[PDB]
């Protein structure tokens, strides 16, 4: 039978870590039909990958694009960097379930202004009706759970409220969620104690689902914070992921030696533990006034009362207004910012850990976003692999494909093998690179030649109508 698509003349890096090999790839009915010599095989569509690498589409394990499938459906910031699948609902905040009327959280604003969904089934129904550009897997946020179950989300939960959150989690998992996420460094999640988190972890563990976590503190208390979530995994057996692992502030640079060692002790004991990073020494989230006097070069990404301040340094704003930086930050609220507080050499060492995946952590709603939104994966390929030689291209591709699929349980994805879904990316290994900078954070990558999602082209030319992305129901 005629192939729907064929990619010939290139070198395949299938995600297994095996050395690249010269071979063609054929696609039929959304899946990889064959791999080998297809030069003379008839195909409806054909791509010449001569001089390029043909690999599995990249899986962004740390997305916050929950509401973008309806707000900004193009998802060009993903496809332009080779991403074919994204895991949303991270750091305790997700599209569903909806908070109780009146209950809110600063971190939720980062997802966008679209009213949140009632529950996971409602969210997935919306995605089924308006198919996403790329595949979407979803985690349920602990913040959402607390905001949906507690009339006072700043209190300790009653036995009934704890059970309510567990029941909501169970429902979400039955609906297809891949697990739940926590944002322990943010309200209301920070209020949670071990019993509350372990209770939710037991529900996920029972169904072989995940607990991805933005730990309690990533600065002075980073080691204890890692220990806290590892203790949960150890005691419940729940597969765990340490989100955007890092060490903030000069006095904490180098502590990854200790945190990674603890992570190793945990996985040696049988607990499934992984982590992810974005390739930059600056973080980005809501503007936190308490940081105004401890971190220099805080750059505003957005501000509701002062939208003219996006892209400006807090110090320059405060100087102009004639007030101290803390006062200026309070006047900018609600707002978001970028914090340059990590050691890039350490970021690289963390990425080298065998269980580290790539998570862009892009904030698509930001007026002047952190460039990781558009350049994370290509920065890894161009700067971490080609420029720094932190690992081979074959190893890096595995971290972006097969590893994520294994950690999140995505059957028939993350690898180029017959029968698997045809999520494919074709790129030039010598030119692939990010172009997004701190000043111009939305510049598209170079070196990405084409991207297929379930066998359909999404890059460089997006589909005219219905998009190829699928909801990855666990
Ligand atoms: C929305 P988020 O929780 O994924 N952003 C974190 C903030 C880390 C920090 O500065 O506390 C980051 O950029 O790593
Ligand atoms: Zn986070
Ligand atoms: Zn996040």
CSV table of C-alpha atoms and ligand atoms in Angstrom, one decimal:
chain,number,residue,atom,x,y,z
A,1,UNK,CA,0.0,0.0,0.0
A,2,UNK,CA,1.0,3.6,-0.7
A,3,UNK,CA,2.6,5.5,2.2
A,4,UNK,CA,1.0,8.7,3.4
A,5,UNK,CA,4.5,10.2,4.0
A,6,UNK,CA,8.1,9.3,3.6
A,7,UNK,CA,11.3,11.0,4.8
A,8,UNK,CA,14.3,10.0,2.8
A,9,UNK,CA,18.1,10.5,2.7
A,10,UNK,CA,18.6,11.4,6.4
A,11,UNK,CA,20.1,9.8,9.5
A,12,UNK,CA,17.8,8.3,12.0
A,13,UNK,CA,18.3,8.9,15.7
A,14,UNK,CA,15.4,6.8,17.1
A,15,UNK,CA,15.5,7.8,20.7
A,16,UNK,CA,16.9,4.5,22.0
A,17,UNK,CA,20.4,6.0,22.4
A,18,UNK,CA,21.7,3.8,19.6
A,19,UNK,CA,24.2,5.4,17.1
A,20,UNK,CA,22.5,7.3,14.3
A,21,UNK,CA,22.0,5.2,11.1
A,22,UNK,CA,21.3,6.0,7.5
A,23,UNK,CA,17.7,5.0,6.7
A,24,UNK,CA,14.3,6.3,5.4
A,25,UNK,CA,11.1,6.5,7.4
A,26,UNK,CA,7.7,5.7,6.1
A,27,UNK,CA,4.3,6.8,7.6
A,28,UNK,CA,0.9,5.4,7.1
A,29,UNK,CA,-2.4,6.1,9.0
A,30,UNK,CA,-0.6,8.3,11.6
A,31,UNK,CA,2.0,5.6,12.5
A,32,UNK,CA,5.5,4.6,11.5
A,33,UNK,CA,4.9,1.9,8.9
A,34,UNK,CA,8.5,1.1,8.1
A,35,UNK,CA,12.1,2.1,8.4
A,36,UNK,CA,14.8,1.3,5.8
A,37,UNK,CA,15.1,1.9,2.1
A,38,UNK,CA,12.0,3.7,0.8
A,39,UNK,CA,13.5,5.6,-2.1
A,40,UNK,CA,11.3,3.8,-4.7
A,41,UNK,CA,8.3,3.5,-2.5
A,42,UNK,CA,5.2,5.5,-3.6
A,43,UNK,CA,4.1,8.1,-1.1
A,44,UNK,CA,1.5,10.9,-1.0
A,45,UNK,CA,4.0,13.2,0.6
A,46,UNK,CA,7.8,13.1,0.7
A,47,UNK,CA,10.5,15.1,2.5
A,48,UNK,CA,14.2,15.1,1.6
A,49,UNK,CA,16.1,14.8,4.8
A,50,UNK,CA,19.5,14.6,3.2
A,51,UNK,CA,22.1,16.0,5.6
A,52,UNK,CA,19.6,16.0,8.5
A,53,UNK,CA,18.6,14.0,11.5
A,54,UNK,CA,15.2,12.3,11.7
A,55,UNK,CA,14.2,11.8,15.3
A,56,UNK,CA,11.1,11.3,17.4
A,57,UNK,CA,9.2,14.6,18.1
A,58,UNK,CA,10.3,16.1,21.3
A,59,UNK,CA,8.2,15.8,24.5
A,60,UNK,CA,8.1,18.9,26.6
A,61,UNK,CA,7.5,17.5,30.1
A,62,UNK,CA,7.1,20.9,31.8
A,63,UNK,CA,4.5,22.9,30.0
A,64,UNK,CA,2.0,25.6,31.3
A,65,UNK,CA,0.1,25.7,28.0
A,66,UNK,CA,-3.1,24.3,29.6
A,67,UNK,CA,-5.4,27.0,28.2
A,68,UNK,CA,-3.5,27.9,25.0
A,69,UNK,CA,-5.2,25.2,23.0
A,70,UNK,CA,-8.2,27.5,23.0
A,71,UNK,CA,-6.5,30.9,23.6
A,72,UNK,CA,-3.7,30.6,21.1
A,73,UNK,CA,-4.2,27.3,19.2
A,74,UNK,CA,-1.2,27.8,16.8
A,75,UNK,CA,1.3,26.6,19.5
A,76,UNK,CA,4.0,27.8,17.2
A,77,UNK,CA,6.4,28.3,20.1
A,78,UNK,CA,6.3,24.5,20.5
A,79,UNK,CA,6.4,23.2,16.9
A,80,UNK,CA,9.1,25.7,15.9
A,81,UNK,CA,11.5,24.0,18.3
A,82,UNK,CA,10.5,20.4,17.4
A,83,UNK,CA,8.0,19.7,20.2
A,84,UNK,CA,5.2,17.3,19.3
A,85,UNK,CA,3.9,16.5,22.8
A,86,UNK,CA,3.5,18.6,25.9
A,87,UNK,CA,2.6,17.7,29.5
A,88,UNK,CA,0.6,20.5,31.0
A,89,UNK,CA,-0.8,21.1,34.5
A,90,UNK,CA,2.6,21.6,36.3
A,91,UNK,CA,3.7,23.2,39.6
A,92,UNK,CA,0.3,22.7,41.3
A,93,UNK,CA,-1.7,24.6,38.7
A,94,UNK,CA,-3.9,23.1,36.0
A,95,UNK,CA,-6.9,23.7,33.7
A,96,UNK,CA,-9.1,21.6,36.0
A,97,UNK,CA,-10.7,21.2,38.4
A,98,UNK,CA,-12.1,24.7,38.7
A,99,UNK,CA,-11.5,26.5,42.1
A,100,UNK,CA,-14.5,27.2,44.3
A,101,UNK,CA,-16.0,30.7,43.5
A,102,UNK,CA,-13.8,33.3,45.2
A,103,UNK,CA,-10.9,31.0,45.7
A,104,UNK,CA,-7.8,32.1,43.8
A,105,UNK,CA,-4.0,31.8,43.6
A,106,UNK,CA,-1.4,34.1,42.0
A,107,UNK,CA,0.3,31.2,40.2
A,108,UNK,CA,-3.0,30.3,38.4
A,109,UNK,CA,-2.9,33.6,36.5
A,110,UNK,CA,0.1,32.3,34.6
A,111,UNK,CA,-2.1,29.9,32.7
A,112,UNK,CA,-4.2,32.6,31.2
A,113,UNK,CA,-7.6,34.3,31.6
A,114,UNK,CA,-9.8,31.5,30.1
A,115,UNK,CA,-12.3,30.3,32.8
A,116,UNK,CA,-11.0,27.1,34.3
A,117,UNK,CA,-12.7,23.8,33.5
A,118,UNK,CA,-15.1,21.9,35.8
A,119,UNK,CA,-13.0,18.7,35.8
A,120,UNK,CA,-10.7,16.7,33.6
A,121,UNK,CA,-13.4,15.1,31.6
A,122,UNK,CA,-14.7,18.6,30.6
A,123,UNK,CA,-11.2,19.7,29.8
A,124,UNK,CA,-10.5,16.6,27.6
A,125,UNK,CA,-13.9,17.0,25.9
A,126,UNK,CA,-13.0,20.5,24.9
A,127,UNK,CA,-9.7,19.3,23.5
A,128,UNK,CA,-11.4,16.5,21.6
A,129,UNK,CA,-13.8,19.0,20.1
A,130,UNK,CA,-11.0,21.5,19.2
A,131,UNK,CA,-8.0,19.3,18.6
A,132,UNK,CA,-4.6,20.7,19.7
A,133,UNK,CA,-1.7,21.3,17.3
A,134,UNK,CA,0.4,18.9,19.3
A,135,UNK,CA,-0.3,16.0,21.6
A,136,UNK,CA,-1.4,16.9,25.1
A,137,UNK,CA,-1.0,15.0,28.4
A,138,UNK,CA,-2.3,16.5,31.6
A,139,UNK,CA,-1.5,16.5,35.3
A,140,UNK,CA,-4.0,17.8,37.9
A,141,UNK,CA,-2.7,20.6,40.1
A,142,UNK,CA,-2.7,20.3,43.9
A,143,UNK,CA,-3.5,24.0,44.1
A,144,UNK,CA,-6.6,23.3,42.0
A,145,UNK,CA,-7.5,20.4,44.3
A,146,UNK,CA,-7.2,22.5,47.4
A,147,UNK,CA,-9.0,25.5,45.9
A,148,UNK,CA,-11.8,23.2,44.7
A,149,UNK,CA,-12.2,21.3,48.0
A,150,UNK,CA,-11.6,23.9,50.7
A,151,UNK,CA,-13.7,26.9,51.5
A,152,UNK,CA,-10.6,28.2,53.3
A,153,UNK,CA,-7.6,27.0,51.2
A,154,UNK,CA,-5.2,28.4,53.7
A,155,UNK,CA,-6.2,26.1,56.5
A,156,UNK,CA,-5.3,22.5,57.4
A,157,UNK,CA,-7.8,20.1,55.7
A,158,UNK,CA,-10.5,18.3,57.6
A,159,UNK,CA,-10.6,14.5,57.1
A,160,UNK,CA,-13.5,15.1,54.7
A,161,UNK,CA,-11.6,17.7,52.7
A,162,UNK,CA,-8.6,15.4,52.5
A,163,UNK,CA,-10.8,12.7,51.1
A,164,UNK,CA,-12.5,15.1,48.8
A,165,UNK,CA,-9.1,16.0,47.2
A,166,UNK,CA,-8.2,12.4,46.9
A,167,UNK,CA,-11.6,11.6,45.3
A,168,UNK,CA,-11.0,14.5,42.9
A,169,UNK,CA,-7.6,13.1,42.1
A,170,UNK,CA,-9.0,9.6,41.6
A,171,UNK,CA,-11.6,11.0,39.2
A,172,UNK,CA,-9.0,12.9,37.2
A,173,UNK,CA,-6.7,9.9,36.9
A,174,UNK,CA,-9.6,7.7,35.8
A,175,UNK,CA,-10.4,10.4,33.2
A,176,UNK,CA,-6.8,10.1,31.8
A,177,UNK,CA,-4.6,12.5,33.8
A,178,UNK,CA,-1.0,11.2,34.1
A,179,UNK,CA,-0.7,12.3,37.7
A,180,UNK,CA,-0.8,15.3,40.0
A,181,UNK,CA,1.6,18.2,40.4
A,182,UNK,CA,2.5,20.2,43.5
A,183,UNK,CA,3.6,23.8,43.9
A,184,UNK,CA,5.0,23.7,47.5
A,185,UNK,CA,6.8,27.0,47.2
A,186,UNK,CA,3.5,28.7,46.4
A,187,UNK,CA,0.2,29.3,48.2
A,188,UNK,CA,-2.0,27.4,48.8
A,189,UNK,CA,0.1,24.2,48.4
A,190,UNK,CA,2.7,25.5,50.8
A,191,UNK,CA,0.2,25.0,53.6
A,192,UNK,CA,0.1,21.2,53.0
A,193,UNK,CA,1.8,18.9,55.5
A,194,UNK,CA,3.2,15.4,54.8
A,195,UNK,CA,-0.1,13.6,55.6
A,196,UNK,CA,-2.0,15.6,52.9
A,197,UNK,CA,0.7,15.0,50.2
A,198,UNK,CA,1.2,11.3,51.1
A,199,UNK,CA,-2.6,10.8,50.9
A,200,UNK,CA,-2.6,12.1,47.3
A,201,UNK,CA,0.6,10.2,46.5
A,202,UNK,CA,-1.1,6.9,47.6
A,203,UNK,CA,-3.9,7.4,45.1
A,204,UNK,CA,-1.5,8.1,42.2
A,205,UNK,CA,0.8,5.2,43.2
A,206,UNK,CA,-2.1,2.8,43.3
A,207,UNK,CA,-2.8,3.6,39.6
A,208,UNK,CA,0.9,3.8,38.7
A,209,UNK,CA,0.6,7.6,38.1
A,210,UNK,CA,2.9,10.5,38.8
A,211,UNK,CA,3.6,13.1,41.4
A,212,UNK,CA,5.6,15.9,39.7
A,213,UNK,CA,6.7,18.6,42.1
A,214,UNK,CA,7.9,22.1,42.3
A,215,UNK,CA,9.5,21.6,45.7
A,216,UNK,CA,9.1,23.6,48.8
A,217,UNK,CA,12.2,25.7,48.4
A,218,UNK,CA,14.9,25.9,45.7
A,219,UNK,CA,17.4,28.1,47.6
A,220,UNK,CA,18.6,27.7,51.1
A,221,UNK,CA,16.2,24.8,51.8
A,222,UNK,CA,16.7,23.0,48.5
A,223,UNK,CA,18.2,19.9,50.0
A,224,UNK,CA,15.5,19.5,52.6
A,225,UNK,CA,12.9,20.2,49.9
A,226,UNK,CA,14.2,17.4,47.7
A,227,UNK,CA,14.3,15.1,50.7
A,228,UNK,CA,10.7,16.0,51.5
A,229,UNK,CA,9.3,14.8,48.1
A,230,UNK,CA,11.7,11.8,48.0
A,231,UNK,CA,10.3,10.8,51.4
A,232,UNK,CA,6.8,10.8,49.9
A,233,UNK,CA,7.9,8.6,47.1
A,234,UNK,CA,9.8,6.2,49.4
A,235,UNK,CA,6.9,5.8,51.7
A,236,UNK,CA,4.1,5.5,49.1
A,237,UNK,CA,6.1,4.1,46.2
A,238,UNK,CA,4.7,6.9,44.0
A,239,UNK,CA,6.7,7.6,40.8
A,240,UNK,CA,8.2,11.1,41.3
A,241,UNK,CA,9.5,13.9,39.1
A,242,UNK,CA,11.5,16.9,40.5
A,243,UNK,CA,10.3,19.8,38.3
A,244,UNK,CA,12.8,22.4,37.0
A,245,UNK,CA,15.5,21.2,39.4
A,246,UNK,CA,17.9,24.0,40.3
A,247,UNK,CA,19.8,25.7,43.1
A,248,UNK,CA,19.1,29.4,43.5
A,249,UNK,CA,21.3,32.1,45.0
A,250,UNK,CA,25.2,32.1,45.1
A,251,UNK,CA,25.3,30.5,48.6
A,252,UNK,CA,23.4,27.5,47.3
A,253,UNK,CA,25.3,26.9,44.0
A,254,UNK,CA,26.7,23.4,44.0
A,255,UNK,CA,24.2,21.9,46.2
A,256,UNK,CA,23.0,19.8,43.3
A,257,UNK,CA,25.8,17.4,44.2
A,258,UNK,CA,23.8,16.6,47.4
A,259,UNK,CA,20.3,16.7,45.9
A,260,UNK,CA,21.2,14.5,42.9
A,261,UNK,CA,22.9,12.0,45.3
A,262,UNK,CA,19.7,11.8,47.4
A,263,UNK,CA,17.7,11.3,44.2
A,264,UNK,CA,20.2,8.5,43.3
A,265,UNK,CA,19.8,6.8,46.7
A,266,UNK,CA,16.0,6.9,46.2
A,267,UNK,CA,16.0,5.3,42.7
A,268,UNK,CA,18.6,2.7,43.9
A,269,UNK,CA,15.9,1.7,46.4
A,270,UNK,CA,13.3,1.1,43.8
A,271,UNK,CA,11.5,4.5,43.6
A,272,UNK,CA,11.0,5.8,40.1
A,273,UNK,CA,12.4,9.3,40.2
A,274,UNK,CA,13.3,11.6,37.4
A,275,UNK,CA,13.7,15.4,36.9
A,276,UNK,CA,13.8,18.1,34.3
A,277,UNK,CA,15.4,21.4,33.5
A,278,UNK,CA,15.3,24.2,31.0
A,279,UNK,CA,18.7,25.3,29.7
A,280,UNK,CA,19.0,28.7,31.3
A,281,UNK,CA,20.4,30.3,34.6
A,282,UNK,CA,17.4,32.5,35.1
A,283,UNK,CA,13.9,31.4,36.4
A,284,UNK,CA,10.5,33.0,35.7
A,285,UNK,CA,7.3,33.1,37.7
A,286,UNK,CA,5.1,35.6,39.5
A,287,UNK,CA,6.8,38.7,40.9
A,288,UNK,CA,7.7,38.2,44.5
A,289,UNK,CA,8.4,41.5,46.4
A,290,UNK,CA,10.3,39.6,49.1
A,291,UNK,CA,13.0,39.0,46.5
A,292,UNK,CA,13.5,42.7,45.5
A,293,UNK,CA,16.4,43.2,47.9
A,294,UNK,CA,18.1,39.8,47.5
A,295,UNK,CA,18.2,39.4,43.7
A,296,UNK,CA,19.6,41.9,41.3
A,297,UNK,CA,18.4,42.3,37.7
A,298,UNK,CA,14.8,41.3,38.3
A,299,UNK,CA,13.1,41.8,34.9
A,300,UNK,CA,9.4,42.3,34.6
A,301,UNK,CA,7.6,39.9,32.2
A,302,UNK,CA,4.1,41.4,32.7
A,303,UNK,CA,2.2,43.7,35.0
A,304,UNK,CA,-1.6,44.3,35.1
A,305,UNK,CA,-1.5,47.8,36.6
A,306,UNK,CA,1.7,48.8,34.8
A,307,UNK,CA,1.8,46.9,31.4
A,308,UNK,CA,4.3,49.5,30.1
A,309,UNK,CA,6.9,48.0,32.5
A,310,UNK,CA,7.2,44.6,30.7
A,311,UNK,CA,10.9,44.1,29.8
A,312,UNK,CA,12.1,46.6,32.4
A,313,UNK,CA,14.4,46.0,35.4
A,314,UNK,CA,12.7,46.4,38.8
A,315,UNK,CA,15.6,48.6,39.8
A,316,UNK,CA,15.1,51.0,36.9
A,317,UNK,CA,11.4,51.2,37.6
A,318,UNK,CA,11.9,51.9,41.3
A,319,UNK,CA,14.5,54.6,40.5
A,320,UNK,CA,12.2,56.3,38.1
A,321,UNK,CA,9.3,56.3,40.7
A,322,UNK,CA,11.6,57.4,43.5
A,323,UNK,CA,10.8,54.5,45.8
A,324,UNK,CA,12.6,51.3,47.0
A,325,UNK,CA,12.5,48.1,44.9
A,326,UNK,CA,10.2,46.3,47.4
A,327,UNK,CA,7.6,49.1,47.1
A,328,UNK,CA,7.9,49.2,43.3
A,329,UNK,CA,7.2,45.4,43.2
A,330,UNK,CA,4.1,45.8,45.3
A,331,UNK,CA,2.9,48.6,43.0
A,332,UNK,CA,3.5,46.3,40.0
A,333,UNK,CA,1.3,43.5,41.4
A,334,UNK,CA,-0.1,41.4,40.0
A,335,UNK,CA,3.0,40.8,37.8
A,336,UNK,CA,5.6,38.3,36.7
A,337,UNK,CA,9.3,38.4,36.5
A,338,UNK,CA,12.6,36.7,35.5
A,339,UNK,CA,15.2,35.9,38.2
A,340,UNK,CA,18.8,35.5,37.3
A,341,UNK,CA,19.9,33.4,40.3
A,342,UNK,CA,21.4,30.1,39.1
A,343,UNK,CA,24.9,28.9,38.0
A,344,UNK,CA,24.7,27.9,34.3
A,345,UNK,CA,27.5,25.4,34.9
A,346,UNK,CA,25.4,23.7,37.5
A,347,UNK,CA,22.3,23.8,35.3
A,348,UNK,CA,24.4,21.8,32.8
A,349,UNK,CA,25.6,19.3,35.4
A,350,UNK,CA,22.0,18.7,36.5
A,351,UNK,CA,21.0,18.1,32.9
A,352,UNK,CA,23.8,15.5,32.6
A,353,UNK,CA,22.1,13.3,35.3
A,354,UNK,CA,20.8,10.1,33.7
A,355,UNK,CA,17.2,10.8,34.6
A,356,UNK,CA,17.0,14.4,33.5
A,357,UNK,CA,14.5,15.3,30.8
A,358,UNK,CA,14.0,18.7,29.1
A,359,UNK,CA,11.1,20.9,30.3
A,360,UNK,CA,10.8,24.3,28.6
A,361,UNK,CA,8.6,25.8,31.4
A,362,UNK,CA,7.4,28.4,28.8
A,363,UNK,CA,4.9,30.9,30.1
A,364,UNK,CA,2.9,31.6,26.9
A,365,UNK,CA,0.6,34.2,28.5
A,366,UNK,CA,3.5,36.6,29.5
A,367,UNK,CA,3.8,39.9,27.7
A,368,UNK,CA,7.6,39.7,27.6
A,369,UNK,CA,8.4,36.0,28.4
A,370,UNK,CA,11.5,34.2,29.3
A,371,UNK,CA,13.1,33.0,26.0
A,372,UNK,CA,12.8,29.3,27.2
A,373,UNK,CA,9.3,29.6,25.8
A,374,UNK,CA,10.7,29.5,22.3
A,375,UNK,CA,14.3,28.1,22.5
A,376,UNK,CA,14.6,25.4,25.2
A,377,UNK,CA,14.9,22.3,23.0
A,378,UNK,CA,17.0,23.8,20.3
A,379,UNK,CA,19.3,25.4,22.8
A,380,UNK,CA,19.9,22.0,24.2
A,381,UNK,CA,20.7,20.6,20.8
A,382,UNK,CA,22.8,23.5,19.6
A,383,UNK,CA,24.4,24.8,22.8
A,384,UNK,CA,24.5,21.9,25.2
A,385,UNK,CA,25.2,19.2,22.6
A,386,UNK,CA,27.0,20.7,19.7
A,387,UNK,CA,28.8,23.6,21.5
A,388,UNK,CA,29.5,22.1,24.9
A,389,UNK,CA,29.5,18.4,24.1
A,390,UNK,CA,27.7,17.6,27.4
A,391,UNK,CA,26.6,14.4,25.7
A,392,UNK,CA,26.1,13.0,22.2
A,393,UNK,CA,23.2,14.0,20.0
A,394,UNK,CA,21.9,10.4,20.3
A,395,UNK,CA,21.9,10.7,24.1
A,396,UNK,CA,20.2,14.1,24.1
A,397,UNK,CA,17.5,13.0,21.8
A,398,UNK,CA,16.7,10.1,24.2
A,399,UNK,CA,16.3,12.6,27.0
A,400,UNK,CA,13.7,14.5,25.0
A,401,UNK,CA,11.8,11.5,23.7
A,402,UNK,CA,12.2,7.9,25.0
A,403,UNK,CA,12.9,9.0,28.6
A,404,UNK,CA,9.8,11.2,28.9
A,405,UNK,CA,7.7,8.5,27.3
A,406,UNK,CA,9.0,6.0,29.9
A,407,UNK,CA,8.6,8.3,32.8
A,408,UNK,CA,5.0,9.5,31.9
A,409,UNK,CA,3.9,6.2,30.4
A,410,UNK,CA,3.3,7.2,26.8
A,411,UNK,CA,2.8,4.0,24.8
A,412,UNK,CA,3.9,4.0,21.2
A,413,UNK,CA,5.6,7.5,21.4
A,414,UNK,CA,9.0,8.8,22.1
A,415,UNK,CA,10.7,6.4,19.6
A,416,UNK,CA,11.1,5.8,15.9
A,417,UNK,CA,10.0,2.2,15.5
A,418,UNK,CA,7.4,0.5,13.4
A,419,UNK,CA,3.9,0.8,14.9
A,420,UNK,CA,4.7,3.9,17.0
A,421,UNK,CA,2.8,7.1,16.4
A,422,UNK,CA,4.5,9.2,13.7
A,423,UNK,CA,5.5,12.2,15.9
A,424,UNK,CA,8.7,13.2,14.0
A,425,UNK,CA,11.2,16.1,13.8
A,426,UNK,CA,13.7,16.6,11.1
A,427,UNK,CA,16.6,18.9,11.9
A,428,UNK,CA,20.1,19.9,10.8
A,429,UNK,CA,22.5,18.9,13.5
A,430,UNK,CA,25.1,21.5,12.5
A,431,UNK,CA,22.8,24.5,12.4
A,432,UNK,CA,20.0,23.7,14.9
A,433,UNK,CA,19.9,26.4,17.5
A,434,UNK,CA,17.7,28.7,19.6
A,435,UNK,CA,17.4,32.4,18.5
A,436,UNK,CA,15.2,33.6,21.4
A,437,UNK,CA,17.1,36.0,23.6
A,438,UNK,CA,16.4,37.9,26.8
A,439,UNK,CA,15.6,41.0,24.8
A,440,UNK,CA,13.8,39.2,21.9
A,441,UNK,CA,12.3,36.1,23.6
A,442,UNK,CA,10.0,35.1,20.8
A,443,UNK,CA,12.5,34.7,17.9
A,444,UNK,CA,12.0,31.3,16.3
A,445,UNK,CA,14.7,28.6,16.2
A,446,UNK,CA,16.7,27.7,13.1
A,447,UNK,CA,17.7,24.3,11.9
A,448,UNK,CA,14.2,22.7,12.3
A,449,UNK,CA,13.3,21.5,8.9
A,450,UNK,CA,9.9,19.8,9.5
A,451,UNK,CA,7.7,18.4,12.2
A,452,UNK,CA,5.0,15.7,12.0
A,453,UNK,CA,2.4,15.1,14.7
A,454,UNK,CA,0.7,11.7,14.3
A,455,UNK,CA,1.9,11.7,10.7
A,456,UNK,CA,0.6,15.1,9.8
A,457,UNK,CA,2.8,18.1,9.1
A,458,UNK,CA,2.5,20.9,11.6
A,459,UNK,CA,5.8,22.7,10.8
A,460,UNK,CA,6.8,24.6,8.7
A,461,UNK,CA,3.2,24.7,7.3
A,462,UNK,CA,0.5,24.2,9.9
A,463,UNK,CA,-2.7,22.3,8.9
A,464,UNK,CA,-5.4,24.3,7.2
A,465,UNK,CA,-8.3,23.1,9.4
A,466,UNK,CA,-8.4,20.3,12.0
A,467,UNK,CA,-5.2,19.8,13.9
A,468,UNK,CA,-3.5,16.4,14.4
A,469,UNK,CA,-2.8,16.5,18.1
A,470,UNK,CA,-4.4,13.9,20.4
A,471,UNK,CA,-5.3,14.0,24.1
A,472,UNK,CA,-3.0,11.4,25.7
A,473,UNK,CA,-5.4,9.7,28.1
A,474,UNK,CA,-3.5,7.6,30.6
B,1,LIG,C1,6.0,28.9,37.0
B,1,LIG,P1,7.3,27.9,37.6
B,1,LIG,O1,7.0,27.4,38.9
B,1,LIG,O2,7.5,26.7,36.6
B,1,LIG,N1,8.7,28.9,37.4
B,1,LIG,C2,9.9,28.6,38.2
B,1,LIG,C3,10.2,29.6,39.3
B,1,LIG,C4,11.4,29.3,40.3
B,1,LIG,C5,11.5,30.5,41.3
B,1,LIG,O3,12.1,31.5,40.8
B,1,LIG,O4,11.1,30.3,42.4
B,1,LIG,C6,11.1,28.5,37.3
B,1,LIG,O5,11.2,29.3,36.3
B,1,LIG,O6,11.9,27.6,37.5
B,2,LIG,ZN1,7.4,25.5,39.3
B,3,LIG,ZN1,6.3,25.3,36.1
